[PDB]
Amino acid sequence: AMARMSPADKRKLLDELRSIYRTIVLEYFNTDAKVNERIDEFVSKAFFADISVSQVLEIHVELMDTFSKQLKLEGRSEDILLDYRLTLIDVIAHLCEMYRRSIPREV
Template identity: 60%
Template sequence: MVPLHIGYLAGTTLPQNLERILPPDRYVLTPVEHFDEGTNLDCLLVFDGKIPDLEIPIVVIGEEQLECKTAQVHPQDLEKLPSTIDATIASFLDQIDRDQTIIDQQHRLSEKLKERLGYLGVYYKRNADQFLRAMSPEERSAYLAKLAETYKMIALEYFKESPDRLNQKIDEFASMAFLADVSVSQVLEIHINLMDQLSKQLRIQGHKDEILLDYRITLIDVIAHLCEMYRRSILPKGGNL
């Protein structure tokens, strides 16, 4: 998983235990000379200072209770900082321009999650307004068609692609399905419909369709990815992964 780049204003005295709380394999602490340099960061930490007007996730560490909705962690509760950072980033990614179509919103969000947060980004919150059942019939049909096309690409290249590229495509499909609350039975239906199409093509060409049985492993692989995301959507006691 790609580590998150967490910025803070250069010259700030950081708590001594911060590196223990934010392990470097997951969080890279990056000093910036000015807050406007933070646009390439994944999140910005502000220590008892003025909150900058930037379009990036911000977490304030301080004792004074803020009136705004900016995420805040008390200095005595720094153990909560990792989960607060992840939740803040996930919430930020969810704030997408409402003028976009639902399909565009889902695609943009899944791409960002896939790129940076992996499963963590969708761990905290999904938008029920973007679930499949909340879409109009036209949007639902278009979304399922896009899912089916992505699945077809995975199946046809399953035994050809490099593992990294294949996993990226499977993650993309699983993220799209998860964010829209697509059920496993609907994924199974997509698989069956594709196998029916391929079977007809093979028979027309005079070939046997037994080879399609090999694609059961494709279905198992995809469903395993999706089930893992649904499993991680249930917060355990204590809120820890």
């Protein structure tokens, strides 16, 4: 909203988006954590920072590789991989929702 924001500040945001997105994922199965807070934080910044879904899409791919990678080496169940698919789809749908509501329609 403000004047062209510096490039680093943008990366700083991304730095947070990577960790936040990641945090959302860890709390997806939280026992009491309000992932919504994680999702809201990501959803909030993504809209404000005008973050294209691409990063959300690409960033997810890299982290998703991180989990499947450990699963292969750690010899763990990869069934949990869906969580990333669910988190990725659920997350994108959430910000996609506000984008829809952020568009005034003639009445």
